[PDB]
With several copies, the nearest count.
Chain A
């Protein structure tokens, strides 16, 4: 034992995935008005598995498009972006406390 992997856990890979998800969600919000653009989804479980050791998912629209072809539901995108930011803040707190505890033990302070 006594290794950074065994000490940090999955809180280092989770942060990267949460930032990846925010990039995907922000892309859907920006491309909301572009006709023909299809909303992009991200699988957290698969992304976390790939990050730990190392495809395109589309979001099914709740209602038909008005003709443009864009399936971005901006009501859902804001809700997911808000959730992603909260869980990302927790992951930083979880990962940040891993380093603080490691520093505390190696210095006894």
Chain B
């Protein structure tokens, strides 16, 4: 794998306190998946 992915745009460029991104997608950003 080693693939980095996530929701682009205005949804991602917010503090994580908003929690508008699903946790599955949020970890996907990290790079572990």
24 pairs, A vs B, C-beta closer than 8 Å: A33-B8, A34-B6, A34-B8, A35-B5, A35-B8, A35-B12, A36-B5, A36-B31, A39-B16, A56-B13, A57-B12, A58-B13, A58-B14, A58-B15, A59-B12, A59-B16, A60-B16, A65-B18, A66-B19, A67-B12, A67-B13, A67-B16, A69-B4, A69-B29
From DSSP, what is the main secondary structure of chain B's interface residues?
loop
Q: Tell me if B1 is interfacial: C-beta within 8 Å of chain A.
A: no
Interface residues of B (CB under 8 A from A): 4-9, 12-16, 18-19, 21, 29-31
Instruction: Report if A65-B19 is in contact (Cβ < 8 Å); known contacts: A36-B31, A57-B13, A58-B13.
Output: yes
Q: How large is the interface on A (under 10, 10 to 19, 20 to 34, 35 or more residues)?
A: 20 to 34
B6 contact set on A, CB distance < 8 A: 34-36, 68-69
Give a binary string over A30-62; 1 marks a CB under 8 Å from any B CB, 0 the rest: 000111111100000000000000001111110
